[PDB]
Design a protein around this ligand. Structure first.
Ligand SMILES: CC(C)CCC[C@@H](C)[C@H]1CC[C@H]2[C@@H]3CC=C4C[C@@H](O)CC[C@]4(C)[C@H]3CC[C@]12C
Ligand SMILES: CC(C)CCC[C@@H](C)[C@H]1CC[C@H]2[C@@H]3CC=C4C[C@@H](O)CC[C@]4(C)[C@H]3CC[C@]12C
Lengths: 588, 564, 114, 105
């Protein structure tokens, strides 16, 4: 039988754990109670090997006798979070299949599907196996079903020691009780389960096998409810009848931070109970069992997970397939992606409605206005799409990266790969709809050049917003920052309203690093090349070459160069996003 | 009961003097499912509603008080103080303590308490009487150690959570109500603080008052302090009476509660309908119905004063929020600096005419984004407080408009100064005092009109996202209608009319007529279409648009409910 | 608002005594009534409080005399009474009769030696 | 809440401006009171709320607050000021008093 033992564990960073020592066996369930500042989630994370890199973690963690190092935690300990971040536009079967493909790599999909079916039958999810996740308030699966799906995704890796960070928080009483009985049933199948609860109910007292209490990192008690009641009676605080011993022992071993006399009294009581527990035979028996199973010389070795992760290209392809299947199953996201540029162009067409290409009253003015609005709106639509569709995938990646499945930069690369063709077809539709209706130098080569010169800034702004969302949490801050940056770029970069050959040196240098300058140069060279204007002295440019030389003199001979720069602006942003996600991996 | 605080003050400093209030609900049948609810509470008793204290979107207390946005199929009676319930009687006698707090974070406890007192108490009360009432309210809820501490919520230091709940209770208790009704008072509080708050509410109920409390899942120690308890499951009452005898009741009908188990939890878990299955749904519904059957068979000041109080509270609240003011000043300074350095006129090469036109157009049309953003954020950051103070009857939605306007006016003027004064010298525009003052006044009026438009759009739409979308659409329709983008002449019928009511186009035309009129000439205005309206006419048109937006905002505040 | 105290004298340790505080000038049944003593060489020490009719004439005492001192009030003649038992061990003081404790100790008495 | 009054003893003659300080162990939000016990024994409240004055007392006595230290200032002392002075707090239960200062002429 398996046996986990935490001996003299301590976490400094201020001293969140003070000599924590627990002992769990296979087939037993251990619950951990404490206040908000108790540091039980910190202990769970330290045992799972997630925050042991930022702070010094003392104490040993023996598993089946063999002392595991600070690097073998995530390969033997599973950790189920509380956020339960799942993709809404996916079913349970395909989600678990993707999880198994990202975790396991054995061969034909038959074994993967069989493992998924077995785990669903164990988690009682076979009857909702072909139902979309969605939201429970709009017609999706219940919160208990989402928790079961998360537990199944965690169990797919064939674990033996699992930790749960408040699996009953946010759920109703009946659903929380169902989850407790489910965890008890999973633990009874020759496994180890350690869960934390904010405040359990009265009927969950006799369901657990071990109950521990932590306050400010100090272990007040750890044992079965029978010895719990016995010890709390022997200390002089018997639990009254009809008092929910859970709440009574949560109030008895907590400090009151409202006054300074009550705080000292509560601290004195907590220290008294802790000192009485340190002298009791329960902690002595725990330490004896730990040191005995350490020196058994016959129990089996550490049962790890199934195996490690496969190559990077397979995981990248699986993530790409997952994100495109989640996108194509959400009709709203698809229609926004395909019609944002179209709505922008239709709103722009409602005001102009034509370009008078043979009179100098509103020809150059309306043309410059249209080009400015396009250059300032394509990256805005890209940023809108990014802010609207990325955060869910970013949260899913942040949740699934700590488990050892994949990295976040691979998720970002898959997002870019699945967003390339959609932006391509969207900007192509918007071009084929608006360019011909506006009558802007009717031609096919000019139309293709305009389509490319409006497709490039869309992807550029979308990837910049992707980087900012990978480095900044709040999506509204990123939205406002990208909008302001696009404003500044279309104002300073373009020579429409500033005549760059006359702007100061710092702005002239900044305009060289902005894609808006090259975009506007390409658009001017493509639009004002082969058309003439008519005056009917103050403003009469009778041709287009004169206006081109006035705005950007040497932009005609830099067509291919500006196109290459505008298109190479994208891989630089992709590499910057990869680096930004690699940095983000170390700050959360 | 010996683990919590025991050295407290059991004195009652602010008691209710008057006739005892009564509340009787007879055969209430609330649907869209409360069925056959009937109880009768008097002054001096504390009623705690345990179990499913909600019926979807509106709780039971909102149903009793007459509030509720969902369906209200009524088949029973509600008698308050011996008279049928009505919004007037509820506003006059019943006070409500919501679950989510709504307090200005930059105000101390005493300041906001005096504000609510002078906005609630009649005009015949002298200042000394108001301060005495505030002091009695402070001493009653043991808030004397925090009478000068900021009541700031999260993101600010402020005070604790239980103290914030006590401050809200005092705000709702300043006018000395006869019936108090609190929904989820111990939501998000520690156990000791929840116990102290329950003891304080019990003392308030003992002080010749009628206190009703909503609690979905009460703790084991909170349940022991209940005077009267009302168990409700699936909208049906199962038990109604003393809490200490509750178990003694169920043991009398073949349902004993086992030891070492919370009675409230054990009795809300036993009679709860199970939704995981279909064969157990009715299997528990029949038990609930039988238990319900056995239970049923067993038994001033004015308007100008309100405006002054509101504007003073607003000024005291926003003038102490240093981070937001510094952020706004930073945005203004950054905008002004980039605009003035991009169009730097001091140098060997002066600014061209098209460059000056683009500079004026950008000066006019770069502020609305940040302006609307900040205004809508500030409006949606305090929508619940305004809605609740309008529902409870603090003001009559008239003085609030002018109060908000004259409260945002000074900061808006400072923003306009910071954005426009260090931009006129950097760009080296037309020198002099009259053109600079005219430019400043026009920019100020245009930004004021934009602020009023943002206020109206925020108050007209229920959510922040749709309001921001509509405001951005309006701003873009006014931007494309400007006299710089589409020539102001290639518009057939609709965009021309939009430009006629577009403040950005009028701002651009006014700036052009200020800069290029009789300078080096009106011929540049003649080649364009910016010479058909004099300067004073443009100013009057901007003022009229601002007035129309103010009227729209007032109509939206008066007729549209500001539901959070 | 006049307060006068009486009932002080020589008492053997372990006996019993009763001080009387006569009140005039205001509604005796509307305001609090406190007994606050002072040791012969120490600072003022609050002893007991009796609340008004709005609190149903409930009483409260300090942790040093809780159980031995009993304060009461006669509303017919507006006279506060303080019965002391098992005194003269350390309870020797100059006990004063004050009006309001929560609203500041105003309108003190004259004090009587025990 | 402990009230530390300073100084425990003070000697000042006619004409001087006396200042008696009182520090609270916790925050009382200005809920402090200054009483004057005459040598005969008739105690009377001189200052309430730490800033206001009672009716019938001379205006020479004033109340002030610096940080967490309250101050009673007596300008143009008379012969009727030789007496004991006590500071008390009534912001938290129970109500505690101060050490007291024997103002002697
Ligand atoms: C549906 C009707 C109302 C049309 C709505 C179109 C809206 C959603 C789109 C189309 C054109 C878009 C604008 C195009 C240009 C810019 C300039 C950019 O720097 C900030 C965003 C901004 C201001 C966009 C705001 C949103 C916008 C107005
Ligand atoms: C309920 C909570 C989350 C509401 C928070 C409102 C947030 C999302 C909104 C309201 C005000 C907005 C800010 C207004 C001003 C600016 C300054 C600008 O240079 C960067 C964006 C930034 C910083 C905005 C970011 C988003 C913002 C902070």
């Amino acid at each position: 039988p398996h046996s986990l033992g935490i001996l003299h564990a301590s976490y400094s960073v201020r001293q969140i754990l003070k000599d924590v020592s627990l002992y769990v066996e296979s087939g037993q369930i251990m619950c951990i109670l404490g206040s908000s500042g108790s540091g039980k989630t910190t202990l769970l994370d330290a045992m799972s090997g997630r925050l042991g890199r930022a702070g010094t973690f003392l104490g040993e963690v023996y598993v089946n006798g063999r002392a595991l190092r600070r690097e073998q935690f995530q390969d033997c300990f599973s950790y189920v979070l509380q956020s339960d971040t799942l993709l809404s536009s996916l079913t349970v079967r395909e989600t678990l299949h993707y999880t198994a493909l990202l975790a396991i790599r054995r061969g034909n999909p038959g074994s993967f599907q069989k493992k998924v079916e077995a785990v669903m039958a164990e988690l009682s999810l076979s009857h909702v196996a072909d139902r979309l996740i969605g939201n429970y308030s709009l017609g999706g699966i219940s919160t208990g079903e989402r928790r079961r799906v998360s537990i199944a995704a965690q169990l797919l890796q064939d674990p033996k020691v699992m930790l749960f960070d408040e699996p009953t928080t946010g759920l109703d009483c009946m659903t929380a009780n169902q989850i407790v009985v489910l965890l008890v049933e999973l633990a009874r199948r020759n496994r180890i389960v350690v869960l934390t609860i904010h405040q359990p109910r009265s009927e969950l007292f006799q369901l657990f096998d071990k109950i521990a209490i932590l306050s400010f990192g100090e272990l007040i008690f750890c044992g079965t409810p029978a010895e719990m009641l016995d010890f709390f009676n022997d200390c002089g605080y018997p639990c009254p009848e009809h008092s929910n011993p859970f709440d009574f022992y949560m109030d008895l071993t907590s400090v009151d931070t409202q006054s300074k006399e009550r705080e000292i009294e509560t601290s004195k009581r907590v220290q008294m109970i802790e000192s009485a527990y340190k002298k009791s035979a329960i902690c002595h028996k725990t330490l004896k069992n730990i040191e005995r199973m350490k020196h058994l010389k016959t129990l089996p070795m550490v049962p790890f997970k199934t195996k490690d992760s496969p190559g990077v290209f397979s995981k990248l392809g699986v993530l790409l397939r997952r994100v495109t299947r989640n996108l194509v199953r959400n009709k709203l996201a698809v229609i926004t992606r395909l019609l944002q540029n179209l709505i922008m162009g239709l709103f722009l067409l409602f005001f102009v409605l034509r370009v008078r290409s043979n009179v100098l009253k509103g020809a150059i003015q309306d043309r410059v206005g249209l080009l400015y609005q396009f250059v300032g709106a394509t990256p805005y639509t890209g940023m809108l799409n990014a802010v609207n569709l990325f955060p869910v995938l970013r949260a899913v990646s942040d949740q699934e990266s700590q488990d050892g499945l994949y990295q976040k930069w691979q998720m970002m690369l898959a997002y870019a790969l699945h967003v390339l063709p959609f932006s391509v077809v969207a900007t192509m539709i918007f071009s084929s709809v608006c360019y011909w209706t506006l009558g802007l130098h009717p031609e096919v080569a000019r139309f293709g050049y305009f389509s490319a010169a409006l497709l490039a800034p869309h992807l550029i702004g979308e990837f910049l917003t992707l980087v900012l969302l990978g480095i900044v949490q709040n999506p509204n801050i990123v939205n406002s920052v990208v909008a302001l940056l696009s404003i500044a770029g279309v104002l300073v970069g373009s020579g429409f309203l500033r005549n760059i050959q006359e702007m100061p040196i710092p702005f002239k240098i900044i305009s060289y690093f902005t894609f808006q300058k090259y975009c506007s140069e390409i658009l001017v060279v493509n639009e004002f090349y082969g058309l003439n204007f008519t005056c009917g002295n103050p403003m009469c440019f009778t041709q287009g070459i004169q206006f081109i030389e006035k705005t950007c003199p040497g932009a005609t001979s830099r067509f291919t160069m500006n196109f290459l720069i505008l298109y190479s602006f994208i891989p630089a942003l992709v590499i910057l996003g990869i680096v930004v996600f690699k940095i983000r991996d170390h700050l959360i | 009961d010996r683990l919590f605080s025991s050295e407290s003050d059991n004195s009652l400093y602010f008691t209710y003097s008057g006739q005892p209030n009564t509340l009787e609900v007879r055969d209430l049948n609330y649907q869209v499912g409360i069925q056959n609810l009937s109880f009768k509470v008097r002054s001096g008793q504390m009623l705690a509603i345990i179990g499913s204290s909600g019926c979807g979107r509106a709780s039971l207390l909102d149903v009793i008080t007459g509030r509720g946005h969902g369906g209200k199929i009524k088949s029973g009676q509600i008698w308050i103080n011996g008279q049928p319930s009505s919004p007037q009687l509820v506003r006059k006698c019943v006070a409500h303590v919501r679950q989510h707090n709504q307090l200005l974070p930059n105000l101390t406890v005493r300041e906001t308490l005096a504000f609510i007192a002078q906005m609630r108490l009649p005009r015949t009360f002298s200042q000394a009487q108001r301060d005495k009432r505030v002091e009695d309210v402070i001493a009653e809820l043991r808030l004397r150690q925090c009478a000068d501490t900021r009541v700031g919520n999260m993101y600010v230091r402020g005070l604790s959570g239980g103290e914030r709940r006590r401050v809200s209770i005092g705000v709702q208790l300043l006018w000395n109500p006869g019936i108090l009704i609190l929904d989820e008072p111990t939501s998000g509080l520690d156990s000791f603080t929840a116990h102290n708050l329950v003891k304080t509410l019990s003392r308030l109920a003992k002080g010749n008052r009628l206190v009703l409390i909503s609690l979905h899942q009460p703790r084991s120690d909170i349940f022991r302090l209940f005077d009267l308890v009302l168990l409700m499951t699936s909208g049906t009452p199962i038990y109604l009476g003393a809490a200490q005898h509750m178990v003694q009741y169920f043991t009398a009908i073949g349902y004993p509660c086992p030891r070492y188990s919370n009675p409230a939890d054990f009795y809300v878990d036993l009679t709860s309908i199970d939704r995981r299955s279909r064969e157990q749904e009715l299997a528990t519904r029949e038990k609930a119905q039988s238990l319900a059957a056995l239970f049923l068979e067993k038994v001033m000041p004015g308007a100008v004063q309100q405006f002054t109080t509101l504007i003073r509270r607003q000024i005291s609240n926003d003038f102490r929020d240093l981070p937001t003011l510094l952020i706004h000043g930073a945005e203004a300074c950054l905008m002004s600096m980039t605009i003035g350095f991009l169009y730097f006129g001091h140098g060997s090469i002066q600014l061209s005419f098209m460059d000056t036109a683009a500079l004026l157009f950008m000066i006019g049309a770069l502020i609305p984004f940040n302006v609307i953003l900040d205004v809508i954020s500030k409006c949606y950051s305090e929508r619940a407080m305004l809605y609740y103070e309008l529902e409870d009857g603090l003001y009559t939605t008239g003085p609030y408009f002018f109060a908000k306007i004259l409260g945002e006016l000074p900061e808006h003027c400072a923003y306009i100064i910071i954005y426009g004064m260090p931009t006129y010298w950097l760009a080296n525009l037309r020198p002099g005092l009259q053109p600079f003052l005219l430019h400043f006044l026009l920019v100020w009026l245009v930004v004021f009109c934009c602020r009023i438009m943002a206020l109206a759009a925020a108050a007209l739409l229920p959510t922040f996202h749709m309001a921001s979308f509509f405001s951005n659409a309006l701003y873009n329709s006014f931007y494309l209608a400007g006299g710089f983008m589409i020539n102001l002449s290639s518009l057939w019928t609709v965009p021309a009319w939009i430009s006629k009511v577009s403040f950005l186009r009028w701002c651009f035309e006014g700036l052009m007529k200020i800069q290029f009129s009789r300078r080096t000439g009106d011929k540049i205005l003649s080649v364009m279409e910016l010479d058909s309206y004099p300067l004073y006419a443009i100013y009057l048109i901007v003022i009229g648009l601002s007035g129309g937006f103010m009227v729209l905002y007032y109509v939206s505040l008066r007729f549209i409910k500001q539901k959070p | 608002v006049k307060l006068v105290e009486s009932g002080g004298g020589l008492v053997q340790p372990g006996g019993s005594l009763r001080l009387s505080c006569a009140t005039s000038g205001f509604t005796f049944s509307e305001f609090f009534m406190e007994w606050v003593r002072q040791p012969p060489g120490k600072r003022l020490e609050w002893v007991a409080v009796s609340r008004n009719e709005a609190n149903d004439y409930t009483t409260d005492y300090s942790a040093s005399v809780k159980g031995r001192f009993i304060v009461s009030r006669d509303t017919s003649q507006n006279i506060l009474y303080l019965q002391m038992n098992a005194l003269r061990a350390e309870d020797t003081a100059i006990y004063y009769c004050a009006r309001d404790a929560w609203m500041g100790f105003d309108y003190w008495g004259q004090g009587t030696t025990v | 809440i402990q009230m530390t009054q300073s100084p425990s003893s003070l000697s000042a003659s006619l004409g001087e401006r006396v200042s008696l300080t009182c520090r609270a162990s916790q925050e009382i939000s200005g809920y402090l009171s200054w009483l004057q016990q005459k040598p005969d024994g008739t105690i009377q409240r001189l200052i309430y709320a730490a800033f206001s004055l009672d009716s019938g007392v001379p205006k020479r006595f004033s109340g002030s607050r610096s940080g967490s230290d309250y101050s009673l200032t007596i300008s143009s002392l008379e012969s009727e000021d030789l007496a004991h002075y006590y500071c008390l707090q009534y912001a938290s239960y129970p109500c505690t008093f101060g050490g007291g200062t024997k103002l002697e002429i």
